Symmetry: C3
Subunit: 306 residues, 3 copies
């Protein structure tokens, strides 16, 4: 049972400074010791240094840093693919959520039947034609879903990406801030999700049951858990760039991670969008980083009953 | 789909200064743009100025400002009745909860088969003979309930009031601070309520399902939503006159409002008891006012899934 | 209906100063008036002064203040036994949880068929051979449990203790910080528990139903409620020695207590581990003390509906 930890200090998928310090904050909160204590054999890749791209001008006068996000993701994908091939479950510390483009591509490279659990306040499924921000961290799923590719134009630095999962192969949990074109996309391609409303109705236990039934009800598949810290209520995870009131409780987040662990299928985990600079106090930054560690640890077997 | 907004800056239903600034606070939290964005056609009646009453002495050496509360409500009912008759769903911003005497009377004047969902930590059903405070914001339901007529003395300024709701036409949600004579009244007239305890047991989905079965299970009826901000836990809505621990969560509040919207029958809404002056900080005032806007917006169609 | 209140200002079951002030803090939060208001006839035993033991050296170079904890508990057990004998439901205010040794022994003397509901973030069932702290407040169940007596060494000051609880006769609620030897003990003796995880799944209503089915499903038994304030989430009860995130909500705590009261079988209650000195502010101290009073009051009939 081996875990690779990769620091992906990326900020260019969005516009708020400081999310590149997320991996450091998470390590400082004791991630490595927590993983070791659960019996994980660890390989720390440290924090990647991504190759910059000169003159990375706006795409279509809207999409920011496309070539940089493309190249960093290509490089990240290579590291992830390599680590999976060497038998590691891959933990990637962000950094903004655009790096899921790289971790999922790399993961899918030799685990092409992987499935995705995307825990997030947001659907992150705008395309370059629907985004109203230009921020790639709100578009990553659009580049990964095969059903969407007729609707996704080719960005500079993105040509290496081949859409690698189907719309039946991703489930969202925690949605509460969805743009209308994203809502259209989720309905049009019948992508399954559990918004905070569904959690309010069903409860987190049934949500996880139905999630796994949809994804691995008929066959075992390596699971890719892409966890945006903003899934949690901002009272619990204030240090993040797009906080939305009414999020997961601490207990709900742990229960999700616990059930992920319980499948035995976790193969890769992203923990993204922790931005210590956006905390109004050091206490706020640390509680956010500590929560991130709790999620990762619970995902690899830490329980609440000993 | 048209919405009238009436500010009712009234404070004389109770003794704490500042609740008359509720409407301004709610407006400053961006109410009108939020309703507009939902597609609501808006008529703003502004904030009403109520006629003062000279020498408005205590009634029975106990009940405070009876004629002022009576007259202000008569005037409010007139504005409400007129807006409902012209085809608007009527949003009244308070102000203390005694103004529900006027909004429900005025609403019933045009829609006599209305039913009432009363979301509150309190039952607000004391009569002039049971009140231990003398505050009319804690008695408004007693003046409206037909079955209580013979137990409710005639107050100066109140003669215009015709009880318009039967005891089977109101359901309470969120109760946790109920005076013993209020409890007797609720039981003796078989008035249905879901206390915080019931919500703990059933969950808010079943609570809303049962609420609608009781009210509109036999026929469609216009719905009057009377929402006291103190229904929410004090941590979420600190700026209010009688906070009680152990209240609705943010998610529960939104769920109630969403289900109200989903009936298609919402005809009037009160958002009462926001008192910015009781905030310990400007942050606390704004979070309470923002919460008020979320309740109203959700009640008119804002969703958590886009 | 008679209730005896016993202050047990003991701190030597652990190493953090201040928990000996728990009883005064709880009294200051208005305990006696709250109990009177519910119709409780009260006998106040005041705060006991426990006989000190000179030269109370570590047992086995690890276990702290054993003779002092042994003797204080013997004296406590005598007071509890006497009060229960005289027809009182016994409320014991702590003080650290090592005093449950005393209250449960005293209680069991006249009510040998008693059962125990242990509400706590922790299992408190380490033995002198498994404790890693040496603190007796984390071992009291091991001395009470019949099935364990062959694995529990004889401590100085502890010879008066006769195990009086069988493993089928105690149920835990709220567990989330369990040491591995404790987990082993719970599984090996088939001791039933509902962790925070079980509550997330079942909901607190089902948890209480099953608790009582296990304890009193076949016959009526006097109930001993041992409530560690740290069962509650640290945001609600910060003034305590071993806080653990992800605890009971206020509503869940009240619901447990309400259900205890509804059995009609509550015979004794411990409210332990309030340490006002661990509060970072007087507000935090008072809110913890107030929460303790809420629990005790609800356990004796305080309702949320009047
Ligand atoms: N949907 C957003 C906001 C658009 C304006 O409403 C937010 C995307 C958030 C990215 B995340 O990784 O945090 O979920 C976007 O930038 O696309
Ligand atoms: N029930 C109260 C308190 C009486 C003392 O227990 C409070 C009523 C609150 C009015 B609201 O509009 O806020 O719910 C009253 O004044 O009647
Ligand atoms: N289990 C602890 C911690 C051991 C180190 O992990 C804590 C016991 C808490 C005592 B309580 O009365 O608060 O539940 C112990 O001292 O045995
Ligand atoms: Mn997000
Ligand atoms: Mn995201
Ligand atoms: Mn109220
Ligand atoms: Mn009210
Ligand atoms: Mn304990
Ligand atoms: Mn404990």
């Amino acid at each position: 049972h081996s875990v690779a930890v990769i620091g992906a200090p990326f900020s260019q998928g969005q516009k708020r400074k400081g999310v590149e310090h997320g991996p450091a904050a998470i390590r400082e909160a004791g991630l490595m010791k927590r993983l070791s204590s659960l019996g994980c054999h660890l390989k720390d890749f440290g924090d990647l240094s991504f190759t910059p791209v000169p003159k990375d001008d706006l795409y279509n006068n809207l999409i920011v840093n496309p070539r940089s996000v493309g190249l960093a993701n290509q490089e990240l994908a290579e590291v992830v693919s390599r680590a999976v091939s060497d038998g590691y479950s891959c933990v990637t510390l962000g950094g903004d959520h655009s790096l899921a483009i790289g971790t999922i591509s790399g993961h899918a490279r030799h685990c092409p039947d992987l499935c995705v659990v995307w825990v997030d306040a947001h659907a992150d499924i705008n395309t370059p034609l629907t985004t109203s921000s230009g921020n790639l961290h709100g578009q990553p799923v659009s580049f990964l879903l095969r059903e969407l590719q007729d609707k996704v134009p080719q960005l500079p630095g993105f040509s290496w990406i081949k859409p690698c999962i189907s719309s039946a192969s991703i489930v969202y949990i925690g949605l509460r801030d969805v743009d209308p074109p994203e809502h259209f996309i989720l309905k049009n391609y019948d992508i399954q999700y559990f918004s905070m409303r569904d959690i309010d109705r069903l409860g987190i236990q049934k949500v996880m049951e139905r999630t796994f039934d949809l994804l691995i009800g008929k066959r075992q598949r390596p699971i890719h858990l892409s966890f945006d810290i903003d899934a949690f209520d901002p009272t619990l995870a204030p240090a993040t760039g797009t906080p939305v009131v009414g999020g997961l409780t601490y207990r709900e987040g742990m229960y999700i991670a616990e059930e992920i662990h319980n499948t035995g299928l976790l193969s890769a985990l992203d923990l993204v969008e922790v931005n210590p600079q956006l905390a109004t106090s050091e206490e706020e930054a640390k509680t956010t980083a500590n929560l991130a560690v709790d999620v990762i640890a619970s995902s690899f077997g830490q329980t609440r009953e000993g």
